[PDB]
Amino acid sequence: MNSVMHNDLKEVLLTEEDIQNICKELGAQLTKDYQGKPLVCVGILKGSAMFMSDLIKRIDTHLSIDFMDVSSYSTGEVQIIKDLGSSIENKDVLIIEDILETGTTLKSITELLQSRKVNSLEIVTLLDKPNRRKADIEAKYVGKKIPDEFVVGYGLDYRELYRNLPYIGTLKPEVY
């Protein structure tokens, strides 16, 4: 562990500027697609909150937000630790993820929300590791497909640390 935190990184994969550019570009597209619709943006705690927060700045249409907290009992079966606080019937739902990996938990969440009689349901993920997929799920909106290496920053943690970086990258191997 370095006193200076950026010194913990081996490589920066996405700078803050890169991430903000992705938010602007995805936000413009999402604005197009959801303008005038009853859009609810749903984040899955904890890490997705950083990306969501920046993404919704750039969605220039009315929307509400909500959050869920879920735990795997990956077996497809998911435990709801915090459910949505508001109804999604007749709403257009966008689940906002920091990273899509196996998809298993996310697939189960989409099945649940679909049962609530939404108008539509789509996923926007900042990062995608498609090689990791185990469930039959793909995001309509993807920021960047990345190598299957452990990354941290911008919501993504190691041992609960590093979610505060405004960029994303790989750690030196002496850190883990």
Residues of this chain that bind Na ion (CB under 5 A): 53-54
Q: How far apart are CA 40 and CA 62, in angstroms?
A: 9
The site for Cl ion, by CB under 5 A, has a size of 7
CA distances from 108 to 69, 71, 84, 161, 169 (A): 13, 11, 15, 27, 29
The number of beta carbons lying within 10 Å of the beta carbon of residue 36 is 8
Pick the piece of the chain touching Cl ion (CB under 5 A) from 18-26, 37-45, 102-110, 134-142. Answer: 37-45
Residue 64 contact, options Na ion, Cl ion, none, Cβ 5-8 Å cut-off depending on partner type: Cl ion
Closest CB 152 distance from Cl ion, rounded Å: 7
Please, what's the b/e burial string for 39-77 (b: 16 or more CB within 10 A of its CB; e: otherwise)? bbbbbbeebbbbbbebbbebbeeebebbbbebeeeeeee
Residues annotated as catalytic (active site), given as ranges: 101
Closest CB 54 distance from Cl ion, rounded Å: 4
x/- binding map, residues 50-69, to Cl ion, per CB under 5 A?
A: x--xx---------x-----
Binding site for Cl ion (CB under 5 A): 38, 50, 53-54, 64, 150-151
